[PDB]
Scaffold this active site. Structure first.
Site, PDB file in Angstrom:
ATOM      1  CB  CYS A 197      -0.730   0.071   1.322  1.00  0.00           C
ATOM      2  SG  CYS A 197      -1.811   1.472   1.591  1.00  0.00           S
ATOM      3  CB  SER A 228       0.064   3.885   4.185  1.00  0.00           C
ATOM      4  OG  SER A 228      -1.180   4.349   3.650  1.00  0.00           O
ATOM      5  CG  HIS A 282       2.803   7.711   2.949  1.00  0.00           C
ATOM      6  ND1 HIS A 282       3.296   8.236   1.769  1.00  0.00           N
ATOM      7  CD2 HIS A 282       1.487   7.792   2.866  1.00  0.00           C
ATOM      8  CE1 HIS A 282       2.292   8.635   0.988  1.00  0.00           C
ATOM      9  NE2 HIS A 282       1.246   8.375   1.631  1.00  0.00           N
ATOM     10  CG  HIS A 325      -0.904  -1.308   6.621  1.00  0.00           C
ATOM     11  ND1 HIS A 325       0.167  -0.856   5.820  1.00  0.00           N
ATOM     12  CD2 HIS A 325      -2.067  -0.895   6.119  1.00  0.00           C
ATOM     13  CE1 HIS A 325      -0.358  -0.152   4.825  1.00  0.00           C
ATOM     14  NE2 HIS A 325      -1.717  -0.164   4.995  1.00  0.00           N
ATOM     15  CB  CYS A 327      -5.147  -1.457   3.729  1.00  0.00           C
ATOM     16  SG  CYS A 327      -4.858   0.345   3.946  1.00  0.00           S
TER      17      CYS A 327
HETATM   18  N1  LIG Z   1      -7.288   7.131   5.059  1.00  0.00           N
HETATM   19  C1  LIG Z   1      -6.981   5.812   5.121  1.00  0.00           C
HETATM   20  O1  LIG Z   1      -7.501   5.073   5.971  1.00  0.00           O
HETATM   21  C2  LIG Z   1      -5.960   5.361   4.000  1.00  0.00           C
HETATM   22  C3  LIG Z   1      -5.827   3.971   3.747  1.00  0.00           C
HETATM   23  C4  LIG Z   1      -4.930   3.649   2.723  1.00  0.00           C
HETATM   24  C5  LIG Z   1      -4.222   4.578   2.025  1.00  0.00           C
HETATM   25  N2  LIG Z   1      -4.452   5.947   2.394  1.00  0.00           N
HETATM   26  C6  LIG Z   1      -3.641   6.906   1.570  1.00  0.00           C
HETATM   27  O2  LIG Z   1      -4.312   7.106   0.297  1.00  0.00           O
HETATM   28  C7  LIG Z   1      -3.327   7.554  -0.753  1.00  0.00           C
HETATM   29  C8  LIG Z   1      -3.574   6.651  -1.853  1.00  0.00           C
HETATM   30  O3  LIG Z   1      -3.018   5.275  -1.693  1.00  0.00           O
HETATM   31  P1  LIG Z   1      -2.656   4.311  -2.945  1.00  0.00           P
HETATM   32  O4  LIG Z   1      -2.271   3.100  -2.332  1.00  0.00           O
HETATM   33  O5  LIG Z   1      -3.737   4.250  -3.953  1.00  0.00           O
HETATM   34  O6  LIG Z   1      -1.444   5.191  -3.586  1.00  0.00           O
HETATM   35  P2  LIG Z   1      -0.906   5.211  -5.049  1.00  0.00           P
HETATM   36  O7  LIG Z   1       0.444   5.782  -5.074  1.00  0.00           O
HETATM   37  O8  LIG Z   1      -1.147   3.864  -5.700  1.00  0.00           O
HETATM   38  O9  LIG Z   1      -1.954   6.204  -5.679  1.00  0.00           O
HETATM   39  C9  LIG Z   1      -1.961   7.599  -5.836  1.00  0.00           C
HETATM   40  C10 LIG Z   1      -2.187   8.018  -7.195  1.00  0.00           C
HETATM   41  O10 LIG Z   1      -2.187   9.500  -7.207  1.00  0.00           O
HETATM   42  C11 LIG Z   1      -1.721   9.975  -8.389  1.00  0.00           C
HETATM   43  N3  LIG Z   1      -1.203  11.316  -8.264  1.00  0.00           N
HETATM   44  C12 LIG Z   1      -0.027  11.767  -7.785  1.00  0.00           C
HETATM   45  N4  LIG Z   1       0.224  13.045  -7.774  1.00  0.00           N
HETATM   46  C13 LIG Z   1      -0.884  13.565  -8.293  1.00  0.00           C
HETATM   47  C14 LIG Z   1      -1.216  15.010  -8.544  1.00  0.00           C
HETATM   48  N5  LIG Z   1      -0.406  16.014  -8.272  1.00  0.00           N
HETATM   49  N6  LIG Z   1      -2.439  15.159  -9.093  1.00  0.00           N
HETATM   50  C15 LIG Z   1      -3.284  14.172  -9.379  1.00  0.00           C
HETATM   51  N7  LIG Z   1      -3.040  12.805  -9.168  1.00  0.00           N
HETATM   52  C16 LIG Z   1      -1.784  12.542  -8.607  1.00  0.00           C
HETATM   53  C17 LIG Z   1      -0.577   8.976  -8.844  1.00  0.00           C
HETATM   54  O11 LIG Z   1      -0.259   9.241 -10.122  1.00  0.00           O
HETATM   55  C18 LIG Z   1      -1.100   7.724  -8.259  1.00  0.00           C
HETATM   56  O12 LIG Z   1      -1.871   6.946  -9.342  1.00  0.00           O
HETATM   57  C19 LIG Z   1      -1.953   7.446   0.068  1.00  0.00           C
HETATM   58  O13 LIG Z   1      -1.619   8.761   0.323  1.00  0.00           O
HETATM   59  C20 LIG Z   1      -2.129   6.499   1.254  1.00  0.00           C
HETATM   60  O14 LIG Z   1      -1.329   6.770   2.350  1.00  0.00           O
HETATM   61  C21 LIG Z   1      -5.301   6.345   3.343  1.00  0.00           C
HETATM   62  O1  LIG Z   2      -2.813   2.625   4.924  1.00  0.00           O
HETATM   63  C1  LIG Z   2      -2.867   2.749   6.226  1.00  0.00           C
HETATM   64  N1  LIG Z   2      -2.924   3.945   6.803  1.00  0.00           N
HETATM   65  C2  LIG Z   2      -2.623   3.941   8.224  1.00  0.00           C
HETATM   66  C3  LIG Z   2      -3.645   4.584   9.150  1.00  0.00           C
HETATM   67  C4  LIG Z   2      -3.814   6.066   8.687  1.00  0.00           C
HETATM   68  C5  LIG Z   2      -4.145   6.102   7.077  1.00  0.00           C
HETATM   69  C6  LIG Z   2      -3.081   5.328   6.292  1.00  0.00           C
HETATM   70 ZN   LIG Z   3      -2.793   1.046   3.463  1.00  0.00          ZN
END
Ligand SMILES: NC(=O)c1ccc[n+]([C@@H]2O[C@H](COP(=O)([O-])OP(=O)(O)OC[C@H]3O[C@@H](n4cnc5c(N)ncnc54)[C@H](O)[C@@H]3O)[C@@H](O)[C@H]2O)c1
Ligand SMILES: O=CN1CCCCC1
Ligand SMILES: [Zn+2]
Ligand SMILES: NC(=O)c1ccc[n+]([C@@H]2O[C@H](COP(=O)([O-])OP(=O)(O)OC[C@H]3O[C@@H](n4cnc5c(N)ncnc54)[C@H](O)[C@@H]3O)[C@@H](O)[C@H]2O)c1
Ligand SMILES: O=CN1CCCCC1
Ligand SMILES: [Zn+2]
Ligand SMILES: [Zn+2]
Ligand SMILES: [Zn+2]
EC number: 1.1.1.1
Lengths: 374, 374
Positions: free
Chosen positions: A46, A48, A51, A67, A174
């Site tokens: 993922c 994150s 991150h 995770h 996730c």
């Molecule tokens: N809130 C939660 O519970 C939770 C859970 C999982 C992931 N997240 C977060 O969600 C985000 C997405 O995760 P993912 O696994 O799909 O990541 P990822 O890297 O696969 O996806 C992000 C996408 O954003 C695009 N992108 C990047 N910069 C951009 C810009 N300036 N404008 C427009 N599009 C752009 C990329 O090209 C990429 O396809 C992460 O930041 C991750 O930490 C949050």
């Molecule tokens: O993908 C997992 N996470 C961790 C919990 C805060 C949001 C991102």
């Molecule tokens: Zn995640």
């Protein structure tokens, strides 16, 4: 057999930020009261987890990250009553203690025993069960799935259906749940609405899936990577926009194409500017904007409060709003009943030993979810 | 009598910001097609009128401000069908055109023909009906009630009960409605909840009346002017706190007394910092914060997106979320039936001519709502 004793196994340890993971030998202590030791079968990469590497998401190093996973219970500590050796389980990054005010509240899911707000990198008792070179290695959100074996607290584990395909359902840990719940449970996309999704990776495509299940008539995917468009279209996107193709700001473009602004917008990238941009593209009197992306640690955004004053709703959520223990099992059941698909999010499968290559696929923009098999 | 002709009358003009209002003789043009000319009967002094004075709310000068009022139709333009000469009416600062996508949407109120977003300070046709010393005087949000007579567009006026006491119901024109709806319609306070209200002026007190009517068990009023606590208790606050009595930030105090965060918080002052603080003091997983206060023109705030990511909901609204034309008449009816009280927000009554003393009372913190009579 291994019950009650230390296990020696392979784990990808992150000794310092900005560095490749180091596949090394570690020792996993046996579970204590209300603890569960699980044999990992599949874990997804993922954004994150990346991150934790980049410094974006802060948690104590050195650490065993990961995770999003699924495994089988090798043994349980005393007093555990929810799982048994042999059970297929999904580790829960957001626990469900069932006793705090958030667990008792019908709408909360950010259990107060989480390790996200003041990150300790340990197990609920304040200690680690991991050792590598004689040194204690931290835990990541009571999960730490980038290891052949892990130990999690009972409130951080859920028993799922014995016939689920763990190499698929790990996404429910996730990626998939987060995206899907964001749309259906947090935003509550309505039938016939116009949605805008920023970021088309795994969680974004799951946002798109939920919007499409919610009855949305238009789903606009936004990404600066046009290779992401095809799959986005495949799971539900009616149109796709690349902000680099225009001469004006993307919020103007989207408000123009939505005739005034969308009913539901989603930030699923993790950038302060797109968070602001996502809120703005949603209709000013009744638009709803959901923050799903994780922002760079400790940084603030700047926004004009008049964006809210006119009637907009701004919200965010960890793991699509789902109360972790209670939904994970329901979610797998629903996948068992073909209610939704996980295959579209899986573009690469690799052996756990090639984890560093799996992050390279992620970082280069070539993959969506890379599934690591043990 | 006056119908079809220019009326010469007194109006309080604001020639430039930071100045006292100038009671002058102005000429009020007769209504054109779909316009209404009303004889003012009562107008309250709301903190947003002062914002026009201070530069906090920006709209074209010189201007006739005033937007919380109740009057009597003197004459109607051609094609008017909703009100007739003699009716008791309440001017609507947020119009209800009944035809745009927001007016049609079941939850929007911010009608697209409002004069809030790109202030023109005219009537719908782009022209002014006010003249002073041969100079055109701007309107304010299609209302401008600080004058013995005004002319509003049909979509900016509502007909109300012929027997309501206009010197009381003019508060339904802004203050009361905005407060009360903010609580009951926008936030949707739930029975048994804990609310935190920042700002104990007319709107804030009305926010407290709505929380108490929604069934809130605890309602904590917060203000740096303790003189405001007694009345806040009288309409429903269960406790009152003054941020200057503490050595720690008030979000901490509130989080502590609410045992972890409130269920609903409201910023009813108009400061970027209290907006942030009000959001923070709501429980991180399921708290709701509603911005009611108007911030300093064009100024942005700074906040950490994690306050949203864990689950909080941030939102705002113009006029308590009420569709203007449909709700004003129902609210007056409910006041007629004693469903809610307006007397508690009225601390001073003055003749129109004493408008600058009415502003003085506001600014010195001595009053809540000063009602001006014509
Ligand atoms: N809130 C939660 O519970 C939770 C859970 C999982 C992931 N997240 C977060 O969600 C985000 C997405 O995760 P993912 O696994 O799909 O990541 P990822 O890297 O696969 O996806 C992000 C996408 O954003 C695009 N992108 C990047 N910069 C951009 C810009 N300036 N404008 C427009 N599009 C752009 C990329 O090209 C990429 O396809 C992460 O930041 C991750 O930490 C949050
Ligand atoms: O993908 C997992 N996470 C961790 C919990 C805060 C949001 C991102
Ligand atoms: Zn995640
Ligand atoms: N959203 C809408 O549609 C709408 C409608 C009406 C008014 N408003 C806005 O609501 C605000 C309230 O208007 P009002 O007429 O009740 O004003 P008011 O001036 O009567 O009340 C403001 C209250 O805030 C208190 N206050 C000031 N600074 C404070 C601080 N730093 N901390 C804590 N308390 C503080 C003052 O003591 C005062 O009692 C204004 O900004 C007005 O423009 C918005
Ligand atoms: O009290 C009136 N107003 C005007 C509309 C914006 C909010 C404040
Ligand atoms: Zn809990
Ligand atoms: Zn309208
Ligand atoms: Zn007002």
């Amino acid at each position: 057999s291994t019950a009650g004793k230390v296990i020696k196994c392979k784990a990808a340890v992150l000794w310092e930020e900005k560095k490749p993971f180091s596949i090394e030998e570690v020792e996993v202590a046996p579970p204590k009261a209300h603890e569960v030791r699980i044999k990992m079968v599949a874990t997804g990469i993922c954004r994150s987890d990346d991150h934790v590497v980049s410094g974006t998401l802060v948690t104590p190093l050195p650490v065993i990250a990961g995770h999003e996973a699924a495994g089988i219970v090798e043994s349980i500590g005393e007093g555990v009553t929810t799982v048994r050796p042999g059970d297929k389980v999904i580790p829960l990054f957001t626990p469900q203690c069932g006793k705090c005010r958030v667990c008792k509240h019908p709408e909360g899911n950010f259990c107060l025993k989480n390790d996200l707000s003041m990150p300790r990198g340990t197990m609920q008792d304040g200690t680690s069960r991991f050792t590598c070179r004689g040194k204690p290695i931290h835990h990541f959100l009571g999960t730490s799935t980038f290891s052949q074996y892990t130990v999690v607290d009972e409130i951080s584990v859920a028993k799922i259906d014995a016939a689920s395909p763990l190499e698929k359902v790990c996404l429910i840990g996730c990626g998939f749940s987060t995206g899907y719940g964001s749309a259906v449970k947090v935003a509550k996309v309505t039938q016939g609405s116009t949605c805008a999704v920023f970021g088309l990776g795994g969680v974004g495509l799951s946002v798109i899936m939920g919007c499409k299940a919610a009855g949305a008539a238009r789903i606009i995917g936004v990404d600066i990577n046009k290779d992401k468009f095809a799959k986005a279209k495949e799971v539900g996107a009616t149109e796709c926009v690349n902000p680099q193709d225009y001469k004006k700001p993307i919020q103007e473009v989207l408000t123009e194409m939505s005739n005034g602004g969308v009913d539901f917008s989603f930030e699923v990238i993790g950038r302060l500017d797109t968070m602001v941009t996502a809120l703005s593209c949603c209709q000013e009197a009744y638009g709803v904007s959901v923050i799903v992306g994780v922002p760079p640690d400790s940084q603030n955004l700047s926004m004009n409060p008049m964006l809210l004053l006119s009637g907009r709703t701004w919200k965010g959520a960890i793991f699509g709003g789902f109360k972790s223990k209670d939904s994970v099992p329901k979610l797998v059941a629903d996948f068992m009943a073909k209610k939704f698909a996980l295959d579209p999010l899986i573009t690469h499968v690799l052996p756990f030993e090639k984890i560093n290559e799996g992050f390279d696929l992620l970082r280069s923009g070539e993959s969506i979810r890379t599934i690591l098999t043990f």
